[PDB]
Each structure stands twice: as structure tokens, then as C-alpha cells.
Amino acid sequence: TMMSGRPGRVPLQFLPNEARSLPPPKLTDPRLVYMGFLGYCSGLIDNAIRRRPVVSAGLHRQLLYVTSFVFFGYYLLKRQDYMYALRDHDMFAYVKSHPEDFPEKDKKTYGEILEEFHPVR
Amino acid sequence: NVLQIVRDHWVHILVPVGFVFGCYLDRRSDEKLTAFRNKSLLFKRELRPNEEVTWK
Amino acid sequence: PPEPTIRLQEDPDPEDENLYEKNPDSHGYDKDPIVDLWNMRVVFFFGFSIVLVLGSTFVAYLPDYRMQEWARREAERLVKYREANGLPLMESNCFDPNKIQLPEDED
Amino acid sequence: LQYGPLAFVLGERTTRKLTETSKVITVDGNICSGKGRLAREIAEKLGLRHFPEAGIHYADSTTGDGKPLDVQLSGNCSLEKFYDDPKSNDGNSYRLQSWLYASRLLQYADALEHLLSTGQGVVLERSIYSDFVFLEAMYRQGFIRKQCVEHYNEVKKVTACEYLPPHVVVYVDVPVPEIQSRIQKKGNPHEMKITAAYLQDIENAYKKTFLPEMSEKCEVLQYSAREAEDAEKVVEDIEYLKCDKGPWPDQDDRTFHRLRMLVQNKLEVLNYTTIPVYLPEITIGAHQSDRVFQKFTELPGRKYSPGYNEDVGDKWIWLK
Amino acid sequence: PHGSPDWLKVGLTLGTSVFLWIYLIKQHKEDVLEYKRRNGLE
Amino acid sequence: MLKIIIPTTMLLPMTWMSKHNMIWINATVHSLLISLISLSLLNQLGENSLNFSLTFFSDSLSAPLLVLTTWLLPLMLMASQSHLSKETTTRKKLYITMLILLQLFLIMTFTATELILFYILFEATLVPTLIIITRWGNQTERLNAGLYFLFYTLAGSLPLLVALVYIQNTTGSLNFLIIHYWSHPLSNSWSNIFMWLACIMAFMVKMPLYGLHLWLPKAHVEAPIAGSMVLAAVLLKLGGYGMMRITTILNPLTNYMAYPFLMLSMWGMIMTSSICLRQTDLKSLIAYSSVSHMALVIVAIMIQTPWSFMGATALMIAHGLTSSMLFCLANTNYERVHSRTMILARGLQTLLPLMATWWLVASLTNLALPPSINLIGELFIITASFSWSNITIILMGMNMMITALYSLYMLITTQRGKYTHHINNIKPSFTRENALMALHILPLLLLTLNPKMILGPLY
Amino acid sequence: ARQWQPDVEWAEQFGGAVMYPTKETAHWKPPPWNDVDPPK
Amino acid sequence: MNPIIYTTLIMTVMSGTMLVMISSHWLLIWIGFEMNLLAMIPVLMKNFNPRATEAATKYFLTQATASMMLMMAIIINLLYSGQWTITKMFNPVAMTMMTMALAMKLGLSPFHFWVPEVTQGISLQAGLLLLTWQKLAPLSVLCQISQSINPNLMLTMAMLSILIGGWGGLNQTQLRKIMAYSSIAHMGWMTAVLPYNTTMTILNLLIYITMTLAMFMLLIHSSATTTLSLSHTWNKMPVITSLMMVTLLSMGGLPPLSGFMPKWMIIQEMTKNESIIMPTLMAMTALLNLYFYMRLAYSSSLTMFPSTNNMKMKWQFEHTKQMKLLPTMIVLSTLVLPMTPALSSLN
Numbered sequence A: 001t002m003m004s005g006r007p008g009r010v011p012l013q014f015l016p017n018e019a020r021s022l023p024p025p026k027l028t029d030p031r032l033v034y035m036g037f038l039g040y041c042s043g044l045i046d047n048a049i050r051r052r053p054v055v056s057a058g059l060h061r062q063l064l065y066v067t068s069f070v071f072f073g074y075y076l077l078k079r080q081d082y083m084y085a086l087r088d089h090d091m092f093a094y095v096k097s098h099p100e101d102f103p104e105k106d107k108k109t110y111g112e113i114l115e116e117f118h119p120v121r
Numbered sequence B: 001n002v003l004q005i006v007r008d009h010w011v012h013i014l015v016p017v018g019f020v021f022g023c024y025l026d027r028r029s030d031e032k033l034t035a036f037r038n039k040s041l042l043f044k045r046e047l048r049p050n051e052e053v054t055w056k
Numbered sequence C: 001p002p003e004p005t006i007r008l009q010e011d012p013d014p015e016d017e018n019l020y021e022k023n024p025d026s027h028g029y030d031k032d033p034i035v036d037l038w039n040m041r042v043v044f045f046f047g048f049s050i051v052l053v054l055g056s057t058f059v060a061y062l063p064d065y066r067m068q069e070w071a072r073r074e075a076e077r078l079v080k081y082r083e084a085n086g087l088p089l090m091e092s093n094c095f096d097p098n099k100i101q102l103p104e105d106e107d
Numbered sequence D: 001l002q003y004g005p006l007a008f009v010l011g012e013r014t015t016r017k018l019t020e021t022s023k024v025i026t027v028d029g030n031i032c033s034g035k036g037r038l039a040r041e042i043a044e045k046l047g048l049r050h051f052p053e054a055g056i057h058y059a060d061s062t063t064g065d066g067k068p069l070d071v072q073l074s075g076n077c078s079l080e081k082f083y084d085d086p087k088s089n090d091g092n093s094y095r096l097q098s099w100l101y102a103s104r105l106l107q108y109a110d111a112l113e114h115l116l117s118t119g120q121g122v123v124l125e126r127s128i129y130s131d132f133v134f135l136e137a138m139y140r141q142g143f144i145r146k147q148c149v150e151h152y153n154e155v156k157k158v159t160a161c162e163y164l165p166p167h168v169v170v171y172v173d174v175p176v177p178e179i180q181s182r183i184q185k186k187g188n189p190h191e192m193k194i195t196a197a198y199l200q201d202i203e204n205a206y207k208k209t210f211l212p213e214m215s216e217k218c219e220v221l222q223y224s225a226r227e228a229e230d231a232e233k234v235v236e237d238i239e240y241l242k243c244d245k246g247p248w249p250d251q252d253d254r255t256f257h258r259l260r261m262l263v264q265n266k267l268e269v270l271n272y273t274t275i276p277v278y279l280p281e282i283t284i285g286a287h288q289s290d291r292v293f294q295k296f297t298e299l300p301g302r303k304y305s306p307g308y309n310e311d312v313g314d315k316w317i318w319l320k
Numbered sequence E: 001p002h003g004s005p006d007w008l009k010v011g012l013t014l015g016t017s018v019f020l021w022i023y024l025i026k027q028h029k030e031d032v033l034e035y036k037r038r039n040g041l042e
Numbered sequence F: 001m002l003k004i005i006i007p008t009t010m011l012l013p014m015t016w017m018s019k020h021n022m023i024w025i026n027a028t029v030h031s032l033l034i035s036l037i038s039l040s041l042l043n044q045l046g047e048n049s050l051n052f053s054l055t056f057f058s059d060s061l062s063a064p065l066l067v068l069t070t071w072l073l074p075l076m077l078m079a080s081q082s083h084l085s086k087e088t089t090t091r092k093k094l095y096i097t098m099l100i101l102l103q104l105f106l107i108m109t110f111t112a113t114e115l116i117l118f119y120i121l122f123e124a125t126l127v128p129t130l131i132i133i134t135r136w137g138n139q140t141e142r143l144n145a146g147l148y149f150l151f152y153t154l155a156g157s158l159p160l161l162v163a164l165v166y167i168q169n170t171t172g173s174l175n176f177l178i179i180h181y182w183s184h185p186l187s188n189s190w191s192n193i194f195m196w197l198a199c200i201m202a203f204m205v206k207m208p209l210y211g212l213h214l215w216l217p218k219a220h221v222e223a224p225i226a227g228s229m230v231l232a233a234v235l236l237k238l239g240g241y242g243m244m245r246i247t248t249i250l251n252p253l254t255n256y257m258a259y260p261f262l263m264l265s266m267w268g269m270i271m272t273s274s275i276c277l278r279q280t281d282l283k284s285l286i287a288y289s290s291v292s293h294m295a296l297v298i299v300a301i302m303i304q305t306p307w308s309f310m311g312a313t314a315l316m317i318a319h320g321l322t323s324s325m326l327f328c329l330a331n332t333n334y335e336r337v338h339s340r341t342m343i344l345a346r347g348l349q350t351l352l353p354l355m356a357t358w359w360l361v362a363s364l365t366n367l368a369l370p371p372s373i374n375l376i377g378e379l380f381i382i383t384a385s386f387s388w389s390n391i392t393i394i395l396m397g398m399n400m401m402i403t404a405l406y407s408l409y410m411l412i413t414t415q416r417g418k419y420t421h422h423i424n425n426i427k428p429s430f431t432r433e434n435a436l437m438a439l440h441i442l443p444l445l446l447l448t449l450n451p452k453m454i455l456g457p458l459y
Numbered sequence G: 001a002r003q004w005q006p007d008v009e010w011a012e013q014f015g016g017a018v019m020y021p022t023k024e025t026a027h028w029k030p031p032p033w034n035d036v037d038p039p040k
Numbered sequence H: 001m002n003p004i005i006y007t008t009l010i011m012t013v014m015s016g017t018m019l020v021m022i023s024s025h026w027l028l029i030w031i032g033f034e035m036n037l038l039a040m041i042p043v044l045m046k047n048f049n050p051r052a053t054e055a056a057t058k059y060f061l062t063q064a065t066a067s068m069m070l071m072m073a074i075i076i077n078l079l080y081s082g083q084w085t086i087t088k089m090f091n092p093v094a095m096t097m098m099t100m101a102l103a104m105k106l107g108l109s110p111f112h113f114w115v116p117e118v119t120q121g122i123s124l125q126a127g128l129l130l131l132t133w134q135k136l137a138p139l140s141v142l143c144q145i146s147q148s149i150n151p152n153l154m155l156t157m158a159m160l161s162i163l164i165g166g167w168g169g170l171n172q173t174q175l176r177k178i179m180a181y182s183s184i185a186h187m188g189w190m191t192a193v194l195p196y197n198t199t200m201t202i203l204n205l206l207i208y209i210t211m212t213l214a215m216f217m218l219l220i221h222s223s224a225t226t227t228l229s230l231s232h233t234w235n236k237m238p239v240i241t242s243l244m245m246v247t248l249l250s251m252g253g254l255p256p257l258s259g260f261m262p263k264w265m266i267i268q269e270m271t272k273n274e275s276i277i278m279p280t281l282m283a284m285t286a287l288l289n290l291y292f293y294m295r296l297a298y299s300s301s302l303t304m305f306p307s308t309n310n311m312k313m314k315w316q317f318e319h320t321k322q323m324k325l326l327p328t329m330i331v332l333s334t335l336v337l338p339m340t341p342a343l344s345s346l347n
């Protein structure tokens, strides 16, 4: 799935207008919480490299780390959800438009399917 | 002494809190798997007069 | 050869320290007697008293979710029924043959 | 605004600070002499900044609080033991020499930083140049091994190849009989044991190698004990001569920016003082290194950065 | 060295964090409202 | 399953926010409480499983391993308290952090409804063990040992990953439930043979298989006591658990492909039991005994009959407990004598009688004395092998005889005879060591009362 | 009684120009501490 | 040099790369490459020594030969179709000329010989720039024409690069040469998935740039260019050595570290195309990179090497200059595996 040449794709939009028809991620999203945790880890490592009390050196700086990570993670999650939604939409449209390439299998019960049996001895 | 041993024993409360949070999260994840509640052929049950869901 | 035979500046290897020396009743946990005693107490209480006894009693009285007595009662009533009706106890077929469609060979 | 590329970009230039009076100068003299007095007198007369001769705990005076640390945490060497037993088995002589060379490198870096940042010149005692003479003495008396002198030469080359030598050097000439008489007159028991052969070897090194090599790239003022008493004549000699043969006139504003970046950030100054050459006199095992590093960390204002130490009394930690 | 907590930097850091959080809360609100209006939920 | 995972994660901030002299107490208490909480996973069903969510599920094969993993951490902390006394607070906190991370990865590995998630955690366990071995080991060989313990593992595990993704590209899923319900036979093909090998070799190397066991003696001998305990008790069982999970897609090709591994295990158990008879190091002898027991478990899994699987589960649990106890006894001797040579300190019964009793009971469980769960697993596997082929009885009985021989040789050499005269620093046993020994041994003799808890899902 | 730590001889394994020295590469020399060669 | 001139040259290098990235005309892509090469040389020669001059002249010779080959490919493509737009080539010979030119620019085997020597000659900051920013333009061009490449040639060069990097890193004591061989191996990993998925190529490029930035900034912070110099860092900055060990573990591809994300994904992608043998060999060869990363970790943080007495003085000083993005680089290079599906952002 290369979508670079997909028709009606504005070159440098992070989020197209149609992406606004999708539900935005909740602020309590586990992925957003992981982004905030990554920001907190970055703050702790920054304190450690500078030889400052790791947990309680700069609260403003750690807060800024967490906030920036959460902000970028929110927008990244929106874009990721939009791209997966496009993939599903295109897949379903292609299956719909090419019925001869996706014929329906005849529903068959196990009562009349002969599976070879291999004993364990 | 209160407000003094707290500053020395605050860490102890964390593990117990985690256990409660994990139980809450397990129930919350259970709430997302109710697509077949009271719908399985084995346990198709007619609800009691004062019942909403068979299980939570 | 004015070399010192001292290849580098190194601390001598320290001798091991006996916990019984500075403190009899040492319990082998810590060199601080108070922390030592409380470490012994917490290990003994939460290991032998809480987990080992209460957990063992909890495992002993676990409800029958494996359905051993349930299967026994089902088999008891099923055997009572088949013995009363003269049915040949267990059948050799696990599924009814009427609802299986074999492929005709015509060989 | 801590000095960096941006300060250079906007306004910060040091060519305008140079007012033909800077004249980084150094004084060389035999053990126990008037060089200290002469250096100070030159410093007050010329308006320069005097730098007392670097000791074992010179670095202790510039970091944390200026008070010196323990011998085990700072230097791991002593001059008194070197005087008492120069042929020691634990290699105190070369460890002392290496620590003193590193201290002189740090002090030269500090002096260059002051001169480049303020425009005010400095006066120094024995610098990174002429620090080798003692080394040569220790080799000729047999106090140290040869591998020590190759290691010292390697470190000295890699370090001193990046700084500007002093404008004019002032050497006070003192004969050995009178140097020993002055040593006996001081009353220091440990200096009593300096053999005349050591002093004579030290003297030979300055004249044979140090004087001609600084004569061809700098200006030299040979003085005796009598003529070093009157600093007016010495100051007049400094004023009359003009430095035009050294590398200093060839320096310009960007090279000065590079040198000012180098003299700051003392870790890069001392970077090659710990090259991984394993000489038994100076290499330290992992266990002793770990124990001593742990001891150093536990010092009051040494666990964290200078502004982040609660036990010293730094406040507002959680907002810095 | 010997320096005070730079209240300009502290104020700027707190302001950036607060502005980003307020912007994020607003953006989520109009995102939810736009999704509901587009999909005809409410 | 989060009600166990979250407290194990909270063990880390609690460890790092503790006082300098409270880390061991807090870690031990809260790890014991986590073990007690995890003990409630033992209430399993006769039906499918405890499917908590899309990510984690529990099974009566997974539950005993989870409980043993949670129980091992307090014992590891008690064993590590002694030799870490002279070390800084930050480094001790780092050591406890490595142990906690190992427990977390093992817990998530044993539930791991996804095969790729199982692989990721099953390989994530590698890092803490390597750091523990190569950082807090004593001898100079530890680095070399670490290298072995690394590359062997990856040499087996890299093909598996490829196979795994290949399966999902054909089947469409790697969820264990979907795999079990939608399983299909493997045709006798070269491609299928190599898929079988890629699926099996990764778990074979960590049992370890007899030919592939070189890393184990090094890694177990050069590791600290906590490292040896976790390596012998839980980390060796990852291969058995993975084989028990993955053999569902390998039928009927297992019938042909099992022969070389069956021969390797049946002969290597004899070889390693014989090696134990001539060993100058206690830790190496215990490591080779572990190799023999895991060879028996490999045979059981390869036979793939109900009695085989029950015996293999029981033997895995029993071996974990017994080997941890044996390593702890060896370390108690070592911390006094500092030599780790079996012949040096002799006649320790006359100086340490209670420790001699602990040695006797550990040797008895290693000897598979009935009605211990060690013998329950041994006998179930032996009966299954006898049904598989009546000639296996010769090899199995020879292994039993040699096992008894080397266990009693180990007991007699160290505890009986005359004390060494020049050794005068044998101090009385501490309460910590005796408590550690009891906390190893009472669970075994108490599990022999309720065997169905450790007999697996085919009970 | 004490954990082993690398000594000087262990460290000198990693001090050559390359690892795994050969007869041809024996005469190679490690680069200068500062990446400057004498102009000769 | 003058900071103004240095900033101008850095922006000229970035503008050349940008010119390559935003243009649709082959002449403008060639011009961007020329601009990048022209402004890159003084950066390599910022600190004057004979070794830096030798590195710069070798780099110039290689890049100029590659540029001439690339222009030859452009002109042949124009000859067989009067097109200037960067798209499918339309000529078999032209594509090969283009592929070899871009392989020479990237440093892929068998055109790898210049990378270790140039990296060793130049300083650490120059090496950071050379190994991070100088791969964007050739890889972007390769992504644009990926539908044209012969898979046989690209896959051969990718496997050769992986093998050469793995084998050549085993023999190194110098840190810059280790980084160069690591970069060669990572380029080999990147170019093996171009025929199938350019998104995986970009993901591998981003992860590799993050890890390389973290490792170079750690090496600059603890100013070491040899193994033995790095072995002294624990006696001053043990936390730096711990971070470096974790970063090295990530660079070796161990789960659950970030470095496992690319190879895994790449392997996964290559399996969707019925390619089984090649990913297997690639992973087995990456074990060599892991071996020499582990040797570095043993020498740096997992064991305590002997120190010297003068180190005590270094205990009294702290770094004046700091990298703001170093903690973020470390975290992004070690702990982003849970965020793998975000690769749908077409990064």
C-alpha cells in the first residue's frame, strides 16, 4: 500500500479536512499516557545528565517535557488513525468494485468435510 | 508521629494503590467485551424483572 | 631493573566482616540491629504466616471450577438412565452418523 | 550571556580589549628565590594580575569553595614525601610531577581566560613551559624512570601545542652555594634534604634548553640576585622592548575567539592529561578508583552541580 | 555558579506549558463537536 | 491480569523512593504480597481458559509458572542481601530494578495471548539477565559466559521470528486461540520441515537441548546467586512453555521430526548424569543435573500425549524449586569458604546440622523420592515413554540410578566425613539462610498434597 | 572475597590500532591522541 | 572558522539537501547534490590537520565521481526519452548508472571503502553530520525511483553492505570506524526494503538517525574517540556510560528496545513478498553488529577499567556546553517500541 500517489492528496497537509469526520482520540488514551511517560523519562534523564536531583530539580522543565510530548502525541495519533481509516476505506471500496476477484466461498459444514486424521502413538 | 512518619513511609502505600488501579482497569477492560452478554446459546437467559445485565 | 613490581595503585583486598562479631543475635540480615530485627520479622510474618498458611488454606478451599463433582453427578445419572433402559452404556460413535455426509467413492 | 559563538557574532571582540599593556609574562627562578617577590612587584607596578605559583591544591581553590581538599581526593601526592624519599617504591615523584603539570596547565588556562576576557595582563611563576626542568632533574638524579619522561613528553606536546607562549620571560639567576645557604636559612626540615646535585641539574636544564628555545620565539630578561631587588629597572626593561617576533602579533580576532573557547571549559583543557597510558606510578585500579570517587561524591558541595546542593544551603532547587 | 532562579525563564516555561494545555483542551473540544456534527450523532 | 502487572511496576518507584536502609524490607514485603495476590490465578477451569482481555489470558499451564515466578523474587532478594552489603545504594537499587524488570517480563511472557508479543517479551527477558550476569558476577569468565548466554539464544530465536511472521502472512493471525481452533495439518515438505525447525530450535536451545547446552554451565556458574536462581527456576521453563504452545501447528510432522531430538535427549540425560559423577564444582554439578531434568522434559513434550504433558508441567515446577534450593545451599557454603570447590570444605554436618538437614531434603527431592512432585512428573513421563516404546525403560532407569548416585555423592562429599582442619571461619548459620531454605522446601512438600494444581491443562 | 575487575593487562588488549593483530598489521600504529601528525 | 561562515555553510548543505528533496527536474536534483558537496567540504575541514585534509579530498573524489555518473545517467535517460522529470527511468542502462551513483553517494558496498576512512579523519561533529544528514538526499531519490530499480542489484548491494559492516566492525578499536561500519550495515538494511516498501525505508532511516545522534552526542559529551579513552568515563560520568550501554543495546536490535522496530518490520514486509532466505541471512549477519556493540558495552559500563591519577582534577569540573536534545534522542532511541503502529503516518 503506497498512498503517496493517491488521488486528491494535498502535498504537505498533516491532517486533511476529511480526517475531521473521524472521532478524535480521548485525552485518557493509553498511547497519550505513554507519550507523557516518555516526556517524563526525558525530563529525568535531562536532570541526571546535568547532575541535578533527578526527581525534583526542575518542575517547570519536566512539565514542559510532558506537555510537549503529549501535544505531539495527540496530533500523531490523529494522523495515524486517519491513515488507517483511509487504508480500510480503500480496501473495502476495491473489494466492492471488483466482485469477480473476491467470489463468495460456499458455506460448508464440518459434517461433510473430510479431514485426514493422524493418530498420536 | 503523624506528618513525620508519612515523609518516611509514603512509599509503602504505592504497591497497594497499584493493585486497586489494576483491578479497576481489569473491570474497565471487561466492560468492552459485552458483545455476546446473554446471547450465547448455552446461557440464553431471560432477564429477571429487576435485572439489567446478567453479569458485569 | 628499578621497576617497583607494583603494576598500579590498588587497594588491598579487604577481609570479610562477621555480623556476629559486632552483634550477636544478628539474624544475618543487616549490620544495623533494629533494621535486622525488623527485616527478620517482616520476612517471617509475610512469608510463613501470610502467604504460606493463608494462601495454602485459600488454595485448599478453592471452589470446583474444574467441575469434578459436576461430571461425577452427570455420569451417575447418565449411567442410571442407560442401565435402566438397557442401552449399551457408552456408544462407540461420538457423533450421530445420520448427520455426517461421507463422500461417495464409486470405486 | 555566557561567552560563545553568539556573543562573538553580536558584539564580543577581544582585539579592542588589547591595550599594549596585556603582555602575558612569566617568571623563572631557582628553588627558593626572589622570583615570587619580583613577580608580585611587577604585578603591582605594571597593573597586571598576579598568579601565585601553582601548588598541589591549586584546582581546589577555583572549584566549589576555595578551601583545599584532602590529599587522597586532590593530587594523591606530596612534596614533603618526595623530599624525604625521592626514590620511593610507590612512584610519588612522577605522580607529583604529573599532578603539578596538570595544575600548571589549568592555571595557564585560567590566566589566558582572564587576559582574553578582560584585557588585563597577568604575571606567573613557573608555567607549563619550564615545568620540564624538574622532570629532567628527576631523571638525572634517578628519581623517576624513562617511561615517565616519554609519557610526560607526550602529554606536554599534545597539551601545550594549543596555547600562546608568554610575551617575555623573566629569569632570576642564583648560584647553587647561595641557593643552599638560603634553603638552610629558611628552616624547613624537608627542604634541608635537597641535594646540591639536584639543584645543579635543575639549573643546567634552564640554561641549556629553556633559555635558547624561549629566546628564538619570545624575549628573555636574564637577571641576577642583586639586580632582581630593584623592580623599577625590570619594569623599564619590560616597557622598552616590543614583542614583534612571537606568534602573538600574528593572532587575530577569530583565532582569539577559538582560544577563548578553549580556555573556558576546563574539561577540554585537561582532556589529554588522562590519556590511557598505563604507567604504574599513575595508573589506578578499579577498586581504589571507585572507593575514592565515592568519597569525593560524598563531599558537601560536590554531589550535584554548584547551584543544586541543599546541604550547602542552595535554595529554590525545585525551580532551577 | 552563584545564580538565582531566572524568573523570566520560569515564567516562559510555565506560560508555554499552560498555553499548550489550554490549546489542546480547546482543540479536543472542537474536534469532538466537528465529528458529532459531521457524523450526525448529536 | 493488570491486578498483578501494575503492582509489579509500582515495585520500581517504591524501590527508588525508599530509604537507603529500607530497600530490602520494602521489596521483600511487597513482592510477597504480589505473590499472594497472584496465588488466586490457580482457580482454573475445566473449559478453555481465563481469557482476561484481547492481550492476556491465563491457563492451568501458565498459572503455576506465574505463581512460581512471583514467589521466586522474595527468595532472590533474601539471597542477594548478603553479598551486596558493601555496595552503594544506587547500585543496589539498580540490582533490585533488574530483578523487578525480569519478573515483569516473565509475567507478561507467560500470559501473552499473541505469539509475537510472547516472542518480544521472551526475548526482552534476555537483557536483565545479561546485565545481572556481566555486572554482578565475580570471576573473569562472566563476560564470556554472558556472550554465550546471548548468542546461543539469538542463534535460535532469530529464525523463529521469521517463521512467526510467515505464519501470520498465511494464516492471518497469531492469536493462540485462533491458531488452536483453526489449526491444519502440515504436509511432509521441505518448506514445512524448515518451518518446523524454525519453530522448534528457539525453544530447544533454552531448555537446553543436549548438544546445545554449552551456554548453561557457564551462565549458571558465573552468575550471582539471584541470577542462578532465576536462570534455573523460570528461564529454563520458557522453552518448555513455548514448545507446549507451538506444537499445535506442527502436527503431524512432529511424528517424523521428533526422532533426532528424542535420541539427543534420551542419550544426553545419561551423558549429563554421568558428567555429574565427575565434577569438581558444586554449581557445575547442579547445572548438569538441570540439563538432565530438562532433557526428560524435552522427551515428554516431544511425545505429546496427555500423560507426557502432565508429567512435564509437574517436573518443570518441581525442578525449578529444587534447583533454586540447591543453588542457595551451594551459595551458603561459598560465602563462607569463597572457593566453590566441592572437595575443599568437608564434614559440614558436624558444624552445621540444620544446614545438613536442608542439604538432605534438597538431595532427596532432587533424587525424586516419592511422593514428591519430582517423582510424580518423572513417573508420568516414564510411563508415557514406555507406551511410546518399551525400550525407553532401560535409559530411564539408568538415568534414575545415576541421578540417585550423584545426588548422594554430592551430599556425602560436602556433609559427611571429617571436617577440614585449616578452615576455621565456618560461622553458625544465619536466620536468613534457614528461612530461605524453608521457604524453598515447604512449598514442594505442600504441593505434593494437591498435585492437580501443577499438572497442567490436560489434567 | 572481591569481585574481579579488569587490570592493566586486560585493558591493553583494546589499546592497539586494530583488534586481532596479524603479521602484516603488526607494524601499524595507533593514531595520535589529538588527530594531528608532525609536519616533518 | 567564523561562526557566521559556519552557519552559512551548514544552511547551504541543508539547502542543497532540500533542493534535492523538493525538485521535480533532474538538473535541479543534480544541482542540489553539487551544492551539498560544495558546502560540505569546509565542515569536514573545520579543524585543520593533515588527516582532515586527506579525509576531505577522499570524500570529494568519491562524491564528484558519483555526481558525474549521476549526470551520465540523466543524459542517457534524456536520450532515450526526452524527459527531465524524476520518475521511472525508461532505460535499463540509465537505471544501473543511477543506482551505482546513488550507492557510491550513500556508501553502500562495494562502494563502502571511503566511509570508515573519512569518518576516522574528521572530527566527531563532522562525523555526526556525515552519518546523519548526508543520507537523506540519495535515499529520497532512491525512494522516488524505487519502481525502476532492478531488485537483484539493490538486494545484492544491501546484503553485501550488511555483511561488510558486520565483519569490518569486529576488527575496530576506534569509535568513529565502529560508527562508520554500523552506518554501512544500517544502509544495507535500509536499501533491502526499497523494492517493496519505501515507508519501511523511511522508518529505518528515522530510527537509525535517532540512535546515531544519541550515540554521537554521548561520544562528544564524554570526549572519547578510542575504546580505552571511553573506558575512563565511568570514573567521572557513570550515568553517561549507562545511557551509552542502553543505546548500544538498542542499536543491536534487541527487544524491547527501539532498534528492534525497523528490522522486525522490514523482515515482516519481506515475508509478505515470499522472501524468506534473505531476511534470515540479514538477521544472522546483524548478530555481528550486536557482538561488537556488546564488546563496547563490556569495555565501557559493564566492567570498571583502571584509571589514572590526574582524573581526580576532572572530578572538580562540569560541562560548560550541553546538548538540549540529547535526553530526547536517548528516550526516542530506546523506548518507542510500543508506538510502532504510528508508522502509518507515512513518516
Ligand SMILES: CCCCCCCCCCCCCCCCCC(=O)OC[C@H](COP(=O)([O-])OCC(O)COP(=O)([O-])OC[C@@H](COC(=O)CCCCCCCCCCCCCCCCC)OC(=O)CCCCCCCCCCCCCCCCC)OC(=O)CCCCCCCCCCCCCCCCC
Residues within 6 Å of the ligand: A040, A041, A044, A045, A048, A052, A053, A054, A055, B014, B017, F009, F012, F013, F014, F016, F017, F090, F091, F094, F097, F101, F104, F127, F128, F131, F135, H238, H239, H242, H243, H246, H256, H301, H302, H334, H335
Ligand atoms: C517495562 C516498562 C515499565 C518500566 C519502565 C523502565 C524505565 C523507566 C525509567 C526510564 C528512565 C527514567 C530515569 C532515568 C534517569 C536516570 C536517573 C538515575 O540515574 O537514578 C538516580 C536517581 C536517584 O539518585 P539521586 O540521589 O537522585 O542522584 C544520584 C545520581 O542520579 C546517580 O548516582 P551515580 O551516577 O553516582 O551512580 C552511578 C550509576 C548511575 O547510573 C544509572 O543508574 C543510570 C540509569 C540507567 C540509564 C537508563 C537508560 C534509559 C532507560 C531505558 C531502560 C530500558 C528498559 C527496557 C528493559 C531492558 C533493561 C535494561 O551508574 C552505575 O552504577 C553504572 C553501573 C550500573 C550497571 C549497568 C547499568 C544498567 C542500566 C539498566 C537500567 C534500566 C532500568 C533503570 C531504572 C531507572 C533508574 C533510576 O534515581 C531516581 O530517583 C529516578 C527513578 C524514577 C523516579 C520515579 C518517581 C515516581 C515515584 C512517585 C510517583 C508514583 C508513580 C505512580 C503514580 C501513582 C502514585 C499514587
Ligand SMILES: CCCCCCCCCCCCCCCCC[C@@H](O)O[C@H](CO[C@H](O)CCCCCCCCCCCCCCC)COP(=O)(O)OCC[N+](C)(C)C
Residues within 6 Å of the ligand: C051, C052, C055, C056, C057, C059, C060, C061, C062, F035, F039, F064, F067, F068, F071, F317, F443, F446, F447, F449, F450
Ligand atoms: C515437627 C514435627 C511435626 C509436628 C506437626 C504434626 C502435624 C502434621 C500434619 C501435617 C502433615 C500431614 C499430612 C496430612 C494433610 C492434612 C490436610 C490435607 O488433607 O488437606 C489438603 C489441602 O491442602 C491443599 O490441598 C494443599 C495446599 C496448597 C499449597 C499452596 C502453596 C502455598 C503458596 C506458596 C508460594 C508457591 C511456591 C511454589 C510455586 C508452584 C488436601 O485436602 P483435599 O482433600 O485435597 O481438599 C481440601 C478440603 N476440601 C475437600 C474442602 C476441598
Ligand SMILES: CCCCCCCCCCCCCCCCC[C@@H](O)O[C@H](CO[C@H](O)CCCCCCCCCCCCCCC)COP(=O)(O)OCC[N+](C)(C)C
Residues within 6 Å of the ligand: F188, F189, F190, F193, F209, F210, F211, F212, F257, F260, F261
Ligand atoms: C548439534 C547439536 C544439536 C542441534 C540440533 C540437531 C537436530 C537437527 C536435526 C534435523 C531433523 C531432520 C532433518 C531432515 C529430516 C528429513 C527426513 C530424512 O532424514 O530422511 C530422508 C531424506 O533424504 C535425505 O536426507 C535428503 C537430504 C540429504 C542432505 C542432508 C544432509 C545430511 C547430513 C546433514 C546434517 C547436519 C545438521 C546441522 C547443519 C548445520 C528420507 O528421504 P525422502 O523420503 O526421499 O524425502 C523425505 C522428505 N520429503 C518427504 C519432504 C521430500
Ligand SMILES: CCCCCCCCCCCCCCCCC[C@@H](O)O[C@H](CO[C@H](O)CCCCCCCCCCCCCCC)COP(=O)(O)OCC[N+](C)(C)C
Residues within 6 Å of the ligand: A004, A010, A011, A012, A013, A014, A076, H199, H202, H203, H206, H207, H210, H332, H333, H336, H339, H340, H341, H342, H343, H345, H346, H347
Ligand atoms: C524515533 C522517533 C522519531 C521521531 C521523529 C521526530 C519528531 C519531531 C518532529 C516534529 C513534528 C513533525 C511534523 C511535521 C509537520 C507537517 C508534516 C507534513 O509536512 O508532512 C506530512 C507527513 O508528515 C510525516 O509523514 C509524519 C511524521 C511523523 C513521524 C512519526 C512516525 C515514526 C514511527 C513510530 C515511532 C514512534 C514515534 C512517536 C514518539 C515521539 C505530509 O507529507 P507528504 O508531503 O504528503 O509526503 C512525504 C512523505 N512520503 C514521501 C513518505 C509519502
Ligand SMILES: CCCCCCCC/C=C\CCCCCCCC(=O)O[C@H](COC(=O)CCCCCCC/C=C/CCCCCCCC)COP(=O)(O)OCCN
Residues within 6 Å of the ligand: F152, F155, F156, F159, F162, F163, F166, F190, F191, F192, F194, F195, F196, F197, F198, F201, F205, F212, H274, H275, H276, H277, H280
Ligand atoms: C542454535 C543455533 C541454531 C541456528 C538456527 C537453527 C534453525 C534453522 C531453521 C531454518 C532457518 C530458516 C528457516 C526459514 C523460517 C521458516 C519459513 C518457512 O518455513 O518458509 C519456507 C521457506 O523455506 C526456506 O526458505 C528454508 C531455507 C533455509 C536457508 C537457511 C539454511 C540454514 C541452515 C540449514 C541446515 C541446518 C538446518 C537445521 C539446523 C538446526 C539447528 C542446528 C517455505 O516458504 P515458501 O518458500 O515461500 O513456500 C514454498 C513455495 N515457494
Ligand SMILES: Nc1ncnc2c1ncn2[C@@H]1O[C@H](COP(=O)(O)OP(=O)(O)O)[C@@H](O)[C@H]1O
Residues within 6 Å of the ligand: D030, D031, D032, D033, D036, D053, D079, D097, D100, D101, D126, D131, D134, D135, D191
Ligand atoms: N614542577 C615541580 N616539580 C617539583 N617540585 C616543584 C615543582 N614546582 C614547584 N615545586 C616545589 O614547590 C616549592 C616552592 O617553590 P619555590 O619557589 O622554590 O619556594 P618559595 O615558594 O618559598 O618561593 C619548592 O620546594 C619546589 O620544589
